[PDB]
Write a protein that binds this ligand. Sequence first.
Ligand SMILES: Cc1cc(CCCOc2c(C)cc(-c3noc(C(F)(F)F)n3)cc2C)on1
Ligand SMILES: Cc1cc(CCCOc2c(C)cc(-c3noc(C(F)(F)F)n3)cc2C)on1
Lengths: 37, 37, 99, 238, 238, 238, 49, 280, 280
Amino acid sequence: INFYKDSYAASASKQDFSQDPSKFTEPVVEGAGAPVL
Amino acid sequence: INFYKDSYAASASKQDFSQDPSKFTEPVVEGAGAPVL
Amino acid sequence: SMMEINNTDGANGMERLRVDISVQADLDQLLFNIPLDIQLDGPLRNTLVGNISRYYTHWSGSLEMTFMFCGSFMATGKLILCYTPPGGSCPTTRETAML
Amino acid sequence: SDRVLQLKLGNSAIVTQEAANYCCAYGEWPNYLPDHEAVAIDKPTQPETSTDRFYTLRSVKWESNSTGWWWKLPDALNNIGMFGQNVQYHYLYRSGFLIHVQCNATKFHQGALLVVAIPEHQRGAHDTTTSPGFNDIMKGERGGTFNHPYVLDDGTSIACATIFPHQWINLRTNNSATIVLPWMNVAPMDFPLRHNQWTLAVIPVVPLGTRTMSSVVPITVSIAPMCCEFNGLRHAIT
Amino acid sequence: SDRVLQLKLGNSAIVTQEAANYCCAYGEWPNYLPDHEAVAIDKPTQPETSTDRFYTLRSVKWESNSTGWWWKLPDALNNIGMFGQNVQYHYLYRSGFLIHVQCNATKFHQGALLVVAIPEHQRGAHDTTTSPGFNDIMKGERGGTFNHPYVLDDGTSIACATIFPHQWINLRTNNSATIVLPWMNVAPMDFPLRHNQWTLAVIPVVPLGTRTMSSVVPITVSIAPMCCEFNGLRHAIT
Amino acid sequence: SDRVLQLKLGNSAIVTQEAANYCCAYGEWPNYLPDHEAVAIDKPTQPETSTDRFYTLRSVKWESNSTGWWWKLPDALNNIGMFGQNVQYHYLYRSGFLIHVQCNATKFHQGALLVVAIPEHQRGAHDTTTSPGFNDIMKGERGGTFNHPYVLDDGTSIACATIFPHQWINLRTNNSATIVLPWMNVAPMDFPLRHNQWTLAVIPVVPLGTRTMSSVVPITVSIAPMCCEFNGLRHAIT
Amino acid sequence: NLIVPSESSDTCSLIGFIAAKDDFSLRLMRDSPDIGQSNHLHGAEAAYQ
Amino acid sequence: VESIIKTATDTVKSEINAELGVVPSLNAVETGATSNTEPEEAIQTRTVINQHGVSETLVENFLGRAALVSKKSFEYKNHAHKNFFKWTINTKSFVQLRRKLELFTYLRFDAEITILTTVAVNYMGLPDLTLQAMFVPTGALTPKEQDSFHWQSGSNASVFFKISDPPARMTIPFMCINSAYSVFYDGFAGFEKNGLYGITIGNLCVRIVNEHQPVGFTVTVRVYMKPKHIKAWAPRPPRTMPYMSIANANYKGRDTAPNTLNAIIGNRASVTTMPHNIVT
Amino acid sequence: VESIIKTATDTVKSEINAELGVVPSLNAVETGATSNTEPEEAIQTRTVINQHGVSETLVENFLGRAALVSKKSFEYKNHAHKNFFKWTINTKSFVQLRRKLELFTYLRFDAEITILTTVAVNYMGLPDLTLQAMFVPTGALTPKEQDSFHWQSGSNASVFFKISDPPARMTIPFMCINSAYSVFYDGFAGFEKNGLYGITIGNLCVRIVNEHQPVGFTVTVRVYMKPKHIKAWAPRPPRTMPYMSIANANYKGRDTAPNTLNAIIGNRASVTTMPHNIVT
Ligand SMILES: Cc1cc(CCCOc2c(C)cc(-c3noc(C(F)(F)F)n3)cc2C)on1
Ligand SMILES: Cc1cc(CCCOc2c(C)cc(-c3noc(C(F)(F)F)n3)cc2C)on1
């Protein structure tokens, strides 16, 4: 875990598996195979 | 924690968060926005 | 604690700790300004807040300046103390400082 | 129905009948600074309608050999209307931006403009070790132009610029681009005169072309600050 | 305990240790324009702290033969700070005012100033049929002086001026006067550049006198607009 | 009502009609030594009224070029009244102190004295490596004066001396200062002849000035030991 | 203006003080630039004698 | 929108398609959105339970590697860099680390620092010297000499290590005055116009505490940095032109492709020429 | 009065004020109390939930740093300081530590001692010598020679360490005969008048246990102290004049500002002169 008193001294944090690609791939307001226009 | 038998050998004590500034900032006997005089 | 506002040549010892103001002949007169340098030597450096802060690198929070008038009881007057957030040159007229 | 759009802020409004939906940078939307994120303790001024409105800058002419244009925010607006006034009178500012780039031509014209909002676009100088100067960076309303759009004038590449919030204006498809930018910074507020959060870049990846009657094809930029807040009031740094 | 007072608006504050209570014109207090009294339909801008704060004008010297001074609102402030900016960029404005006139001397000095806020103080010219001109009326920050204070420069009388919101600065008693003025007009809003709601007049009914060391005795005016609202945004009429 | 004050201890009393509230060093108050903090096992003598009373030292004259004065406790009192007797006959002592510095002038006089109680004020000599001698330190009732008040004669600074229990005597405001000092030491008791817990320093940060009739303006110090206890009785070290 | 009668000094002094409020915070400790040493202090070496 | 992804998405079997008004393969690049055509809609797919993990591309891991940030060699001898050096900390001197950091606009992370030391004679053997690395924050006084008072390090953090010990190591917390480090700064450092455009941590001062020996040695100190507890924002176009300065993004490009200002990708005979075409 | 503070206090939104008899911005310095004007009373504020921690300014941390308290170098050779030295312990020799300790009147703390050793030839290689640091309390006999009986250390505490090992380290308990150490002492050491004014722990005796080699070496011992389990009382005005002696607070001041007895702060042209004024 961590034997130091300061939490920032701890080892790496490799458990953040959440993600939201859409903020980069689909930043459009109006959200299938229908014409995008 | 501490593996030595004498307690003074222990690591630092960084948890004393209490304080009373007033003993230095307001050492006056008689305690808002009212005239201090 | 006391700011050494009168850090000028000719002012020795405690003379440097007090700012002398006199009866003016003109209006809206500028009396003095205070460099807010805590890192660079200045009126605020040798103060409790200044000295201790210099043992650190980052600071955050409000400061407070208190001025005590030490003239005679029969002496009267009104002064205006202005704090100007950074951005430009130090104001030299009351019309500007007042903002 | 996503080719038609009307934007209304304050006393200003814009419509377009040939839009391409519209982009919300990083899927965010502008908002005022919440108490739990605030730093400056003085009560801020929120002008609303006098600052949160569309400001239209001078147009530029799209030419056959154009390399592209750019405008830095908030510099481009630091001297326009009440937004500019607040900026000059306050040490700190904060705001989002609604960007609308417009360019129309003919069904016989072709051309494609990449319209991208680059956060912290730190420019680089070409073939020299000397860093860009103040005048190289602060152009104000006029904005500047790209010397080497191929690498976004910063040694990277326009090819990957799409990683940033953007849209395109492809003449056969649409005549305008709309990008909503939220506050983008590592601090809740900033000093408007020495730092630009966003840079609006309009680059012609596909040059303007046609065989019909030749006419001046302008590109116009309209920008509307959003949720403006100002702190640290003092005199104006005109 | 009514001889001591602190006024705080926006980033400005004033204290006085020799006040005489304070006047609320007609017992009213400034307030924003309610929906049931509104006329202009555009959403107004309420700057708050950037405009509702104390602005200190240049002082005047109280002399043995002084006749009195006056400042018209909002003219006196139409070119000061963010208040002035909003006024120049908007067709319509509305606001109350917190007036604080200050003048100190010695316990060996005597003198009495009538400090009165006159609504619609329409000046008159002396010994001529020609109406006062623009420059006779619009003095800005500098303000003007009375030619015949005895009749308030309008053919009436200073003797009955007490019918208007006022206070006095009687040197042996106090060193400041404070008057809170609400919006005073027949319309919910007005055009700030061609009409003055209030006129601040400071007239020495009892001349300044003393037998002690002679020194310059200034009179200073600090005015803070209150509950400012602006409508009809456009370019600035600088 | 905090400008008026009466102090009464034993057969002595002092009143002041121009006080500035009063200081309780570090917010503490004098008290007798509790059993759980005691070290010396002999039953102590608690004289009360014969020692816990006001002792007034010889006055000093505040001059235009004065640098300041100081008195070390308990040295200043080690030879006065019954307090001095107990001190001379006992090896160990313990007590708090009620300090009252007084100085009045005219409403035409100006001057400001910093009245500070410095714990363990270890003096330093000027421009030499030799430590201060016995006579440089032990002045008794007469007390000493500052050579370089600017640095509190110890290489630090009077500017930050306010970190210590203190008050000021600003002639236009008050004519006396009152400081209540509790026992201050790392030991429950001490030998009174070779160690001073507190040092009373009165320094004129703002020199005495006036343009009226010149007269001698004295500064007087009255000190009252509190909760005195003495242990280790033997003969007197006169 | 500063106004005083004939018998008062016509030049007065102000003393300015400064302090931090309780919303203050300091970070990243470093050595103060306010103190230095060029040689041994007197007696420092005699501690070894 | 947001969700936990631990493995690559699976594929679902898809059937034949002939629907009017439905054209999944058609898109509009102008919207700024990336094509949302799924493989299942472009061709007929089978079902695939994809178990490929996505751990190695976690930002924490992508940036979580110790990289060289500083390298300095000096002469350890009698100087009658005098047995110590002062380094104004920056992360723009070595291209490998620099380029990765510059793939992001903002970065918040704690920094693990590792210091590696080596020595060489100018042969009678290698001395096991003791060194002191002192972190002198902005505004603090930097050592003027190998033995100046500054080294007593009363408040500054110092680390003493021997050449025979494993590399020294400690963690520097995320120390920006902001919520994150600005990998890029489109602004100026001061209130005046003459200020520096773009881009202060402080100075790392390293000295050999041992007095000089009768002979000279060359000592080299390598400092490595490994970010951890990482949070990143706004990805950016990768650097292509060679770097020129640590103070800016100035560019010039290679003399010949690839990566010349004129052409990033090397040339091929024509757009119909297949470079490594299989000649069976 | 007393309370637990873990973060900087928050700010509450404040409104317009115009109350008679209420003047929060007015104060009376003469009372000895510091201005109690709150920001909310001086100007109009907004609400701010302040999450700034206050840990780094805890006294335990402010003083909790290992600082150099002693440095001694001597000749290790055949003396036909003879291969050992005796140091009368004190914490007034090095200004960085001294000044911080002197920010308080009284201090109670246990002391962590770390001993760092380095050697240099007067080149055939550096010897991995063994040293012995012996704590000789007040009143005990100090070693007369490198090999005198005193070193058998039957009761004194001694620590033997090699130059190749990590610095030696142990904790010295708070050992005053009082409840706290007196950082300052306004008194004399003896019952007679000829006594010493101001300001005994004992002697730290360090020797090289190895017999001398055929050649000479210079050995330097640096001792560091880190207070812990700290309690402090009565803060004091910081030192401004350079230190002169370890035995007193004597002062002289620099030759020219800053920190000259005549002027602590450097001069500026006048009280209306802004030193680093922004010239836009
Ligand atoms: C932008 C940006 C800024 C940073 C921070 C880099 C911090 O790294 C430094 C710091 C602060 C300290 C040391 C350091 N080396 O040694 C020590 C010790 F002495 F404190 F241990 N500190 C080394 C580097 C490279 O990362 N990106
Ligand atoms: C005043 C004041 C007094 C102090 C106590 C300082 C104690 O430090 C000493 C002591 C007592 C022991 C050693 C010491 N070094 O080595 C050993 C060992 F041999 F016992 F391990 N003890 C070193 C110093 C500086 O702190 N402030």
